[PDB]
């Protein structure tokens, strides 16, 4: 009973043009009651593309705008597909860069529910051919509804919406189809919109085609506002008008910025690479001669990019001590990247994962930027405000990012990985500073994720001249939708999300942890209140890190002897171990760092077992040396746990690894090169790798150990019984 009707009137005051003879009291009243059925936002979107609605008397073909139609544009087909003659019908929507909608007149749109349907049908046409066509829709989302109907139980749904063209189609409706049969798909969308808008035929649509009815329901009740937003995003004036108010709102804030202010925000956008000059300067003759004799490439804990810089240091100017050296240069040759540091520690800046000096240096800049970004977006110049961000999927899941793009057609996205990635994405967290765009902008080649974030009046941000905002750290995000969209003849994943108090997301993760222990403590016979499993979640693919823990442990349960688990995970719990599932990097989990001697003795990887804490750490985001999933990683690391308990049972006076034994070192002397190249690294890594394959979910991988690692399959099995029975 408020503003809803106000724009209805304004919008209608513009586009709606009544031109009749009979007292335009009833006439003008007809169209009112008729178009009030239509969702308000489709009316403004017609406006948006420059559309006009005309309520005329007589032969509608006898109006200005229409008299310019050829011979064909005169013979249509009603909602039912029955041919007609325009100068006989009562509605028509002309297409073209200057759209128009001509509606005859009658007060019986109340009664003639069949005609009111047609009008709505046509409007529908406007909505899928004229409006949505400009933002590349309907797309995959709607293709899905369409397919759900053809390949489904009752054949009625098809009968009510599809035509033989569609009805007789052999396979499903792929993106390629919708593309060279747009007319077709557009028609279906229209009929669905019609039956849904006309309150009488709605039931027929919900009865014989609920997938369709549900779709149109959710769409005209919310998802349509995001359509309008998209439309607006393509208009130069809209884009500039929006940018301006924002610029205005932050005007005082910016004018007050100092030089240091702009200094900080500036590095926070481009990291300082280490300068070769300083590097060399801090070396020693000892270390610098080693630097030449050193086969930098010969190391395997340095990335090719890092290794690269490391080579250039030779031109410009192994064993134990030797490699110990390369572990320090690794910490030193790292860019000074403030946002990277916040992500790597998930906001835990005091983490002793880097040299004390540089840590302090990072804390100051952060505490400072935290004060610079003190003014919230909340303004009197606007309500909902959507900001945009382009992301690289590898940032959330390198394992999935690995197969997200169709290996052949770079422009297409593999639907398989899509539903997998879409799977448990319910919430996100941001620990570093999110840099977004006021209006959406094309992305880099390696960025197939396009976020559309609804900010909160409470959200603090800084305005940038280039048209971007720098947001505050520790933001809470709820995913509201995830679909495949087309933009610039390439496919992306739109991720509609809404900002919410980080505390809210953290509480979800907190309860989740309580639940996951109240469950496995039981299934293992551990005291009701033990801290076994721990979620250390701080980054953008949060919810997935949580929901994955459950699925990892299930597989670790369904592939290993329950009695081998209990025995081992009891040893662990005894030394206060933990099963840590995290998105921050490993060198930042206490379970590892609180035990290191030197910070340069840190390890980051898919998974990692820590004896001194008896805990298994599993980093979610990455992708371990070819291991199709998180599961396998956990299990391989459990192998280390077992190698721990095993050797322990030997001479308890000193827990040592059973994989150290004189006997085993020999099994490795000949079999160590039969499994995986990675297992070929050493004993403990051969033992866990072998252990892993043995308990694989793919038996194929099991026989592989049996007919290639005999003495091993036997050794590993002995231990198991040894442990079980002890």
């Amino acid at each position: 009973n408020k503003t809803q009707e106000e724009h209805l009137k304004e919008i209608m005051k513009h586009i709606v043009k009544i031109e009749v003879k009979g007292e335009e009291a009833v006439k003008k009243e007809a169209a009112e009651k008729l178009l009030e059925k239509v969702p308000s936002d489709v009316l403004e979107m017609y406006k948006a593309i420059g559309g006009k609605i005309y309520i005329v008397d007589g032969d509608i073909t006898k109006h200005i705008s229409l008299e310019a139609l050829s011979e064909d544009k005169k013979k249509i087909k009603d909602i039912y597909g029955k041919d007609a003659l325009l100068h006989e019908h009562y509605v028509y929507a002309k297409e073209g860069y200057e759209p128009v909608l001509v509606i005859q007149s009658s007060e019986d749109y109340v009664e003639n529910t069949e005609k009111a349907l047609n009008v709505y049908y046509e409007i529908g046409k406007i909505l899928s051919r004229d409006i949505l066509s400009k933002i590349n829709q309907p797309y995959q989302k709607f293709l899905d509804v369409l397919n759900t109907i053809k390949n489904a139980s009752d054949s009625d749904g098809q009968d009510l919406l599809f035509t033989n063209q569609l009805k007789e189609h052999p396979t499903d409706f792929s993106v390629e189809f919708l593309e060279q049969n747009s007319n077709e798909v557009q028609e279906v969308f229209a009929k669905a919109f019609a039956y849904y808008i006309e309150p009488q035929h709605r039931d027929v649509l919900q009865l014989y085609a609920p997938e369709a009815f549900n779709y149109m329901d959710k769409f005209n009740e919310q998802e349509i506002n995001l359509s309008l937003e998209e439309l607006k995003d393509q208009r130069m004036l809209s884009r500039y008008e929006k940018w301006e108010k924002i610029k205005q709102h932050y005007q005082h804030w910016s004018d007050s910025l100092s030089e240091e202010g702009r200094g900080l925000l500036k590095k926070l956008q481009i990291p300082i690479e280490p300068k070769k000059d300083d590097i060399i300067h801090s070396l020693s003759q000892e270390e610098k001669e080693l630097l030449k004799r050193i086969q930098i490439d010969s190391s395997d804990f340095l990335s090719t990019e890092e290794k690269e810089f490391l080579k250039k240091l030779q031109i410009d100017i192994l064993s134990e001590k030797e490699k110990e050296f390369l572990k320090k240069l690794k910490l030193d040759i790292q860019p000074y990247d403030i946002n990277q540091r916040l992500q790597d520690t998930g906001g835990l800046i005091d983490s002793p994962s880097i040299n004390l000096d540089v840590r302090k240096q990072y804390k100051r800049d952060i505490q400072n930027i935290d004060a610079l970004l003190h003014q919230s977006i909340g303004s009197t110049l606007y309500n909902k405000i959507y900001l945009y961000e382009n992301m690289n999927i590898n940032n959330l899941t390198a394992t999935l990012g690995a197969d997200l793009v169709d290996s052949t057609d770079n422009t297409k996205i593999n639907r398989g990985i899509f539903n997998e990635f879409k799977k448990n994405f319910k919430y996100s967290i941001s620990s570093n500073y999110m840099i977004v765009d006021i209006n959406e902008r094309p992305a880099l080649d390696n960025e197939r994720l396009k976020w559309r974030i609804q900010l909160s009046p409470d959200t603090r941000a800084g305005y940038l001249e280039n048209g971007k905002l720098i947001l505050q750290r520790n933001i809470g995000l709820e995913i509201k939708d995830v679909q495949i969209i087309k933009q610039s003849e390439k496919e992306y994943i739109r991720i509609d999300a809404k900002v919410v108090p980080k505390s809210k997301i953290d509480t979800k993760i907190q309860e989740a942890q309580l639940n996951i222990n109240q469950e496995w403590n039981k299934a293992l016979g551990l005291p009701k209140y033990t801290k076994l499993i721990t979620f250390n979640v701080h980054n953008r693919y949060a919810s997935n890190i949580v929901e994955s823990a459950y699925l990892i442990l299930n597989e670790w349960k369904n592939n290993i002897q329950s009695d081998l688990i209990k025995k081992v995970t009891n040893y662990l719990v005894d030394g206060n171990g933990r099963f840590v599932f995290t998105d921050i990097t490993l060198p930042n989990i206490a379970e590892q760092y609180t035990h290191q001697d030197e910070i340069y003795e840190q390890v980051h990887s898919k998974g990692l077992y820590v004896p001194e804490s008896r805990s298994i750490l599993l980093h979610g985001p990455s992708k371990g040396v070819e291991l199709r999933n998180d599961s396998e990683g956990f299990i391989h690391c459990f192998g280390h746990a077992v190698d721990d308990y095993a050797g322990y049972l030997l001479d308890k006076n000193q827990s040592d690894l059973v994989t150290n034994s004189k006997k085993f070192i020999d099994i490795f002397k000949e079999e160590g090169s039969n499994l995986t190249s990675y297992g070929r690294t050493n004993e403990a890594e051969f033992f866990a790798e072998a252990f892993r394959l043995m308990h694989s979910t793919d038996h194929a991988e099991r026989l592989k150990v049996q007919k290639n690692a005999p003495k091993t399959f036997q050794f590993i099995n002995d231990q198991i019984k040894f442990i079980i029975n002890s």
Partner: peptide, 11 residues
Amino acid sequence: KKVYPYPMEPT
């Protein structure tokens, strides 16, 4: 003193 890695695959 040691720990048991499980490296990823960078480039």
